[PDB]
Amino acid sequence: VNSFSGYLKLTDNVYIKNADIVEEAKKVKPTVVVNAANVYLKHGGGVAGALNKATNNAMQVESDDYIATNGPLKVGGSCVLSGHNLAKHCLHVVGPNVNKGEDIQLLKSAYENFNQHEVLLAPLLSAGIFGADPIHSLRVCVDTVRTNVYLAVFDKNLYDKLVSSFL
Numbered sequence: 001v002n003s004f005s006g007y008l009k010l011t012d013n014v015y016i017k018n019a020d021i022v023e024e025a026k027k028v029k030p031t032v033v034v035n036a037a038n039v040y041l042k043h044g045g046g047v048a049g050a051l052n053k054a055t056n057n058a059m060q061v062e063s064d065d066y067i068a069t070n071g072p073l074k075v076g077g078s079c080v081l082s083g084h085n086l087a088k089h090c091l092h093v094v095g096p097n098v099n100k101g102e103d104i105q106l107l108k109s110a111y112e113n114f115n116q117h118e119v120l121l122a123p124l125l126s127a128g129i130f131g132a133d134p135i136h137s138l139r140v141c142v143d144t145v146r147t148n149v150y151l152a153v154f155d156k157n158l159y160d161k162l163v164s165s166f167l
C-alpha cells in the first residue's frame, strides 16, 4: 500500500492520473520523482522547468555541479539526484527530443531506467515539448517498465485521450 490517490489502473504495474506533477510530488513526497531532463540538465521549460521552479532553483544549482563534474548525460540515460522539497530523489531521465531529430527508438532505453526503482511518480517521457506522440510514449512505458509507475498527465484533454485509446 502506498500514498498515491485517484489513479486509474492500466496494467498490473502502471497507473495514470490527470495531475500537475509538481503539485502531486509536493503532496505525496514520493521516494522518486522522474524529471523530463535533457543531457545538460538545463531545466528551462516543460516538466523540468516546472520541477526546478518548485525547488526555488535548487535543482538547477545541484544539476550544474553534477554536469561540471561528470559531463552530459546520454540520450536514453539518467542520473539520480536530490528530490529537494518534492521527493526523496529525482531521477533525471533523458528521453529523445523529436524537435532535435533524436531517434525515437531511444525512448525504450529511457524508460528502462525506471526499472531500477520500485515505485516512481513520472511524466510520459518525450511528451510535451520533446515532440513525441504521448500515446506512443504510454505504449512504450507499459511495454518496458516493470516496476510500479504513477503517471501524472498535466493536460486534462490529453489525459482523457490517453485513457480512452489505451489498449
Ligand SMILES: CCc1c[nH]c2ncnc(NC[C@@](C)(O)C(C)C)c12
Residues within 6 Å of the ligand: 019, 020, 021, 022, 045, 046, 047, 050, 123, 124, 127, 128, 129, 134, 152, 153, 154, 155, 158
Ligand atoms: C510544464 C509542463 C508540465 C508541468 N507539470 C507537468 N506535469 C506533468 N506533465 C507535464 N508535461 C508533459 C505532458 C505530456 O504531461 C503534458 C504536455 C500534457 C507537466
